[PDB]
Ligand binder design. Structure first.
Ligand SMILES: *[C@@H]1O[C@H](CO)[C@@H](O)[C@H](O)[C@H]1NC(C)=O
Ligand SMILES: *[C@@H]1O[C@H](CO)[C@@H](O)[C@H](O)[C@H]1NC(C)=O
Ligand SMILES: [Ca+2]
Ligand SMILES: [Ca+2]
Lengths: 66, 139, 116, 69, 69
């Protein structure tokens, strides 16, 4: 859909796929993310997390105090 | 569980009563990795719906039991340790056995004896304010 | 055995009473009416929240309610504008409001009136 | 209040863009004064104006509907 | 259907009323290869159990509808 990472839409067997509904940011990375069902969209590759602008290397998102 | 990954409870809240401060809860969803991979939504009525299919109570399975109670509510159970109550209009109670005595990360806090570290974020430091506390457990 | 014949007749258009005190009269629960054909496309508060699904039904000879009332979820037929609202899976209650992030919904009568 | 029963209020300058009630926000633009209590904007008069009702113990109020006459 | 194999119906019959000739039927099972491989059992009460799990009516699926009358 948009470079520089690949896209997937849905396998749609009984909807386990992580679509646009569950985008691992650097705040949600560890949390038990929910999955209502696969939705065709766009996402960065698994070894990556989104920040405010785009997806930047995992080892550079800040850790948040107050 | 946060140590052995044996359950997880996730709640959904939406605002009621056309007012700034009144915020309710609609539904609770429970996940049990022991039962393959089961999602058991609890809905606004007395409804239960496991893996998308509305079901008729009582339910018996490998180690899970769901059943009505006398005062028109529900009662989910798991083996000798976990237990829940839920009646329609957003009032959930969750009892828990002393087996999980110190291993829990959630919005209820870990389960040792001290209430002085109950605002402990997933990073590791505890917050002074309640507002920044709950913005850390969003999904 | 008697009712099987009467049902077979009705498929050919013939209507027949054949029921009297002293035979198997339906013993309808209280608050309901044994009355003959009542073309059921309503009498359930579900039909109020979903008004555009289907209505093509024949005569059935069931238990029904007086023509100002509807049946409740648990089985009573007292309500008029006291019967709940159905929504996406759940069940709400008269005079309720909620607002998540996209829509604002209340529910008057038996329908929603979601906006946004 | 007149003899007829007509109400009137006259506010001041230091409340520009700060009033919030049923006579609407106080601003120059006359198109965005149906904002509900939740902060969103609507078009329906009664949906906008039922969000500002107040209840007090004994007196409970329902949702108001436009007259069908 | 026997020619395209679209559905199949089976009934189970047992003896009732402690007599030689009083035989009844208990349950009905319908198999629809269209719904993957679905087994719907119709029980002695009004209960319905799809693939071993009871369901609460009404049910809607691809083209399948079950409801109380
Ligand atoms: C239900 O539908 C029938 C069919 O036209 C209609 O005559 C009746 O007024 C409706 N309402 C009730 C309460 O029966
Ligand atoms: C009114 O106040 C809000 C919030 O400070 C601001 O965004 C908006 O521009 C103000 N309107 C005017 C006309 O100044
Ligand atoms: Ca503690
Ligand atoms: Ca204005």
């Amino acid at each position: 859909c948009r470079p520089p990472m690949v896209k997937l839409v849905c396998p749609a067997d009984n909807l386990r796929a992580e679509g646009l509904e569950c985008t691992k940011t650097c705040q949600n990375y560890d949390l038990e993310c929910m999955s209502m069902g696969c939705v065709s969209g766009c996402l960065c590759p698994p070894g990556m997390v989104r920040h405010e602008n785009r997806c930047v290397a995992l080892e550079r998102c800040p850790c948040f105090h107050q | 569980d946060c140590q052995d990954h044996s359950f997880s409870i996730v709640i959904e809240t939406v605002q009621c009563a056309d007012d700034r401060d009144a915020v309710c809860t609609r539904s609770v969803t429970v996940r049990l990795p022991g039962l393959h991979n089961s999602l058991v939504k609890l809905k606004h009525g007395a409804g239960v719906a496991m893996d998308g299919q509305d079901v008729q109570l009582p339910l018996l399975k490998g180690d899970l039991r769901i059943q009505h109670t006398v005062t028109a509510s529900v009662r989910l159970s798991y083996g000798e340790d976990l237990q829940m109550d839920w009646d329609g209009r957003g009032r959930l109670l969750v009892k828990l056995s002393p087996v999980y005595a110190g291993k829990t990360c959630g919005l209820c806090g870990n389960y040792n004896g001290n209430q002085g570290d109950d605002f402990l974020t997933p990073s590791g430091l505890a917050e002074p304010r309640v507002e920044d506390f709950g913005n850390a457990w969003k999904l | 055995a008697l009712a099987s014949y009467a049902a077979a007749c009705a498929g050919r258009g013939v209507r027949v009473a054949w029921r009297e005190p002293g035979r198997c009269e339906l013993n309808c629960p209280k608050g309901q009416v044994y009355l003959q054909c009542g073309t059921p496309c309503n009498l359930t508060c579900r039909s109020l929240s979903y008004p555009d699904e289907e209505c093509n039904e024949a005569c059935l000879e069931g238990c029904f309610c007086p023509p100002g009332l509807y049946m409740d979820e648990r089985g009573d037929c007292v309500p008029k504008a006291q019967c709940p609202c159905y929504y996406d899976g759940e069940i709400f209650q008269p005079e309720d409001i909620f607002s998540d992030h996209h829509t604002m919904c209340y529910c008057e009568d038996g329908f929603m009136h979601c906006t946004m | 209040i007149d003899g007829s029963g007509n109400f009137q209020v006259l506010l001041s300058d230091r409340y520009f863009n700060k009033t919030c009630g049923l006579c609407g926000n106080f601003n120059i633009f006359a198109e965005d004064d149906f904002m509900t209590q939740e902060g969103t904007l609507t078009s329906d008069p009664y949906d906008f104006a039922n969000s500002w009702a107040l209840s007090s113990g004994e007196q409970w109020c329902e949702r108001a509907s436009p007259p069908s006459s």
